[PDB]
Design a protein around this nucleic acid. Sequence first.
RNA 1: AAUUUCUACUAAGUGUAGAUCGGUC
Lengths: 117, 1115
Amino acid sequence: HNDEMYLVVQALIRACIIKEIDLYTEQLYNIIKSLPYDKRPNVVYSDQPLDPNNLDLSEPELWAEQVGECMRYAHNDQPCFYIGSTKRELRVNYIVPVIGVRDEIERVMTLEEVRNL
Amino acid sequence: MSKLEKFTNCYSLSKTLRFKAIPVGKTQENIDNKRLLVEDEKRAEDYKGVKKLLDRYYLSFINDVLHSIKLKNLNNYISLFRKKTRTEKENKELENLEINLRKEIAKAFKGNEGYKSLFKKDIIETILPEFLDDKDEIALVNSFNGFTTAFTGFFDNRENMFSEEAKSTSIAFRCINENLTRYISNMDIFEKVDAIFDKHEVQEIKEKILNSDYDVEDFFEGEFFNFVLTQEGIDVYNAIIGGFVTESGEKIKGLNEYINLYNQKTKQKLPKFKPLYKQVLSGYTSDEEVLEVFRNTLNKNSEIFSSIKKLEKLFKNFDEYSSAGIFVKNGPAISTISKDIFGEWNVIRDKWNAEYDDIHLKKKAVVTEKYEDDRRKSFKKIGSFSLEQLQEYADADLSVVEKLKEIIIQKVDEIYKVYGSSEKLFDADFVLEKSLKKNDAVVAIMKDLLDSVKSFENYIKAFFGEGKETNRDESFYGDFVLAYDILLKVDHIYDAIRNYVTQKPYSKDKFKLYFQNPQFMGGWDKDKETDYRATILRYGSKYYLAIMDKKYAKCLQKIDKDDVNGNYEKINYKVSFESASKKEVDKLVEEGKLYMFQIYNKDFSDKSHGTPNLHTMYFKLLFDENNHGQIRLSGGAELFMRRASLKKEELVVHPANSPIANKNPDNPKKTTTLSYDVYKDKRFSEDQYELHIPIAINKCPKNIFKINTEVRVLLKHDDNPYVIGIDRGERNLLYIVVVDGKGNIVEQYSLNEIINNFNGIRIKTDYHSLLDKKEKERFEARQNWTSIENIKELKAGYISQVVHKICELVEKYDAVIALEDLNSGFKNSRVKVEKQVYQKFEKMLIDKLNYMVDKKSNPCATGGALKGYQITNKFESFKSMSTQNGFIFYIPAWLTSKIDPSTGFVNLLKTKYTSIADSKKFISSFDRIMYVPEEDLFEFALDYKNFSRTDADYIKKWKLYSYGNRIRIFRFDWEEVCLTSAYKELFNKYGINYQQGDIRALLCEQSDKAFYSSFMALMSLMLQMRNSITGRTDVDFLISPVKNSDGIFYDSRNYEAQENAILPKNADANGAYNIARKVLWAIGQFKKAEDEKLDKVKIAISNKEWLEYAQTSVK
RNA sequence: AAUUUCUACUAAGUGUAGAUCGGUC
Ligand SMILES: [Mg+2]
Ligand SMILES: [Mg+2]
C-alpha cells in the first residue's frame, strides 16, 4: 500500500485540479451566460483538463472561435459550450477564454470577463 | 376587376399530407401481445435478401438471355463503318442499320425466353422457391404473401432498366455501342500494325496456356463477337489482353505490357488495345471502416499513386511526343489554361476570332450581335481545338508545351506539397483513439488532399477531346483513359468520405406498417368495408384512427347512437359521417379488440394562440360542410412507424428557472426564463407514428386553356403591371425591385433581413450579419464540409423565407415576375450566392407555385386552400426554365450591372493598353479634345465609328466629361485618384500646353510611352463605373461620367438616402431595374405585335435594341 | 432550443415564424 496510495494522492491532486476547472467553468459559465452572444470572447475549447492558470500555448490545437449555447447535460446537468453556431455539434466541457482571433494569441486573459461587458 | 378571376383552379394537383399518430390506450400492449414486431423486422431483412437474390437471379437471367444470340448483319456495319464514310445520307443508313441491331437485340429481349413470368407473383412465389438452394432462404421467401408494394416498386426500377432508352444503364447500349465500337476499333488497331508485335507468343504459347480455343487472330471476325457478349467471353478476352493467373503461380501479363516489353527504340510508339467493359450488374457505417478505405486507396504505394506516377511519366512522354492531333474539349477550362499560359481568357478566342476574321470579316465591318452569337455558337460548334492549332494561336516567345509543362509541374508540385504534410499521418500504429467526427486537423488534411486531387481530376477531364474523331495519338490515350478511370474511382472515394463525415447525430428510420392485411385502407370505406379494416373517427380537436382486427371485424358492425355522449362519427359515402357510441369501443380497446391511434399535431393543441400551418388548414377544410369537391381524398394512405435514435444518455436540457441568454441581437429582450424543461431534440428519442394522407385538389377541372397566351392578352389591354427584380448581389445578397408599367420605381428594398410577424409584434432578424458570421466560420474552422453544408441548408431556409416573401408579393401586388435567369450563359463568380442554391430557389418556385394558398384569408372566397391560385405549370426538367413558365417570366441578362441607370452607357471602349500605335490612334480618334477653365473639367466629344465594337449605338457621336472622383483600387492599396489633379499632374508634369482649346493634335506630338500609358490609365479610371471600396461598407456608390440631357450627372449618394427613390440606389438595383426595363421593352413588344402574333413574340432580348431602348427611352 | 420533417428563434410561457410531394439512389 505504498505506491498505490501514492497514485491515489496523484488522483486527488487531479481531483482538486478538475474541481478548480469545474468551479471556474461554473462561474465562467455565469459570466458567459450574462453576455448577449456578441461580447463573447474567442474561447479555446478542450475535452481535457485545461487548467487556465497553467495554460500552455504550444500545440496547434489552440483555436479562437466565438463560443455559445452553454446548456446542460441532463443526466448530470452541465454547462456545455458549442464553439461555433447551433448546427456544428462541437459540444465540449473544458474552456479557456483568450484575447481575440487566431494565430499566436495573447497569453491568458484571466478574470477580465467583467471588462468584456 | 382583377386578373386573378380566371387563373384559379384550372388543373389538378396531388399532395401528400403528413400528421402525427400516437398510441391511445392499451394498443401498444396488444401489439406486444400479438407478436407484430419480429415478423416486420425479419420480413424487412428478408426483403433486403430478396433484393440481393433477385439482383443475383436477374444476373443469371442476363446470363441466360445473352448466351445463345448470333448476328447476321455484323460484317456490313464493320465494313461500312471502316470504309471512311461517304455521307450522301450514308451515316443515317449506317446508324439506321444500328437501330436495326437495337431492334434485333430488343427483339431478343422482348420476343421470347419468358418475359411474362418476370414481374408478377409467380416469379416470386413459384419460380423463386424452386430456385435458391440451401433452403433456409426458401423459408425466408414464403413470408411475403401479397405484400408486393415495395416489390412492385423494385419492379418499376427493373422495368426502367430494360427499355428502348439506350442509356448507360441499358445493356444494349453498352454491349453494342461500347463492345462493338471498341471491337471495330481493336480490329482497326489489329489489322494496321500487329505484324511488328508478335507471331510466336500469341498462337503457340498463349493459346496453349489460356484457352486451347479458336485462334486469337481469328477472334477479330464474326464468330467472336457472338461469344464475347457472355461473361466468359469478357473473362477470356480480358484474360488475354489484360492477363490472368491461369490457376497457377504464373501471373502472366497481356499484350500491351509486351508492347512495353518489345523495346524497339525505348519509346514504343505503337497503338494499344482498348479494354471492354463487363455487365451492368458488375462502408459509410463506422469510422474505422472508411478510415480503412483511406488505408487502402490513398496510401503511399498503391496502384492509384502509381497511376499518378504514370501520369507524370505520361507527361514526360508528352514532352517526347508530337503536338498534333491531341484534341482539347471545349468548355470553360480552355479559358482556364488561357489564364495559365497566356494573359487573359478570350485572347485564345480572339486568336480563333483572328482565323474567323480571316474568313468572314471583310473591309467595312458589319459586325452585329447576331454575328457575335453565330460566332459564339460557332465557337461551340468547333469543339476540337488541337495543340497545333493552339501553337498557331501562340505568338512569339510563347512556348505552349514548356509553359504548360512548367505550370502542370507547378500544379502536381502543389499536390506534392499537400502530400508532404500527409506522410506522417498513418505511418505505423494509426488507430486514432478520438472520433473522426471530433478531430479537426485530419479532416483538413484529407479535405485539401481530395480537393487537390479532385480539382486535378476536373483539369484532366478537361484534357479530353471529342472522341470517335480522326487520326489521334496512340499511347497517350491508353494510360490517359485508364488512369482517368482510377481517378474516377478515387472520385467515388471522395463521394464515400464526403457522404460519411457530414452524418447527423440523429438517424431517421421510418417504415410502413400493415397489421397483416395486404389491403390496408387502399380506398376510403368503399363497398368492401371489411378488407380495409380502418376508418377515421373524430372527437373534437382530437382524431382517432380505427384499425380493426380481422378476428373481430367480421361481427364488429354494432353501431348504436346510444343518445348519451361520445359521438365518434365514422367516415363513409366514398363523404359524410355516421354517429356511434363511446363505451362500446372503449370496451373493445380495453379488452383488446380495436386499435385507435390519435391523429394530432402541434396545431390541434389547446395550448396555442397563433396561426396554424398549411397542412393543418388543408386538413380542416377537408371535412368541412361546404366542400363542393375542391379538396378530396385519394388512395395510398401510409402510416410510418419511426424508431428511436437519441438514447437517454446524451440528452441536454434548458432547465427550469434559469435566465439563459438570447441569440438574436435584434431581440428587444436580452434574457428569458421558463418554469419547466426545454430539451434538445425530444422528437427523436421517442417512438412515433406518422401518417401520410394523400389528397388531390381540383381533380375535376373547370377551365383548361393556354396560360401564357391569356397572360399576353390580358396584359395587352392592361396599362400598369409590376416587375420584381430578384438579383444576386455583391453586398446586398438578395434584392427586390418592384416597378410599374411605365418605369417609375414603386418599391425597391433589400432582403438582408426578414421581418417576422407574430401577434402584431414585428421583430426583424438579419441574415447579412448572420451569414457574414457563417462566412467567418468558413474563414476559420480548419474544416469546411459541415460549414459549407450549413451555408447550403441555411440558404435553403433563407430561400424558403424568400419564397414566403415572393408569395406575399404575388398575393398582394399580383405582378408579372421578371427575376434573374440561370440559362443566359453568364458567369461572374463574385456574388456570395452560388448557382446550385439558386437552382434550388427556382425549383422551389416550380414546386411551390403550382397551387399557391394564402393562410390568413377567407376560405369561402378565393385565395384559401379550397380556391388557391394555379399560376405555374408542372416540373419537367432543369432545361424547362426557358424564357417563360406561367407568370415566371425568365429573362436573360447581359450588361445590366455595369451600365449607367441614368443615361444607358455601357463599357464599349476597350481601354486595355495594347501598344503606342493604337494609343495614338485612340487619341486621334477623338474629334474634339478641349479644355475650359470655368468648369475645370476635361471634355471629350467623340465619335463611335472610329472604335472597335461600337456599332451598337444609335447616335454614334457623344459628349462626355469627367465628374466626381475615383478609387483606383491597386497601384489592395486604396489609391483614391481625383480627376483634374491627375491630368494637371501629368500636364504640369511633362510641361505641355493645356490652357487652349482643340489640343487633340498637341497630345499626339509626344513620342514617350508613359504619357500614352498614363492616358490609357486615366481612361480606364474614367470608364471604371464600379466606384466601390471593397473594404468597409461606408459608401458603395455608383457615380457616372456621362450626364443626361438634363445636364446633371448621376451621383448615387444623393439618390440613396431618400424617401421616394426615382433612381436606383446601387449596382444591384441598377441590374435588376434594368431587367425590369427589359420586360418593359417586352410589353412594348406586346404593344407592337398583333393578337395571334403573341403566340411567337421573341422575349429573349438582344443588346443593340437594348442600347436603343436604354438611350432613347430615359424620359 | 421544444416541431408532422427542414431552417432561422424563445417569440408571453410543454411553444412561436415560414416552406414541403414524394418511397427510391
Ligand atoms: Mg405555429
Ligand atoms: Mg433548430
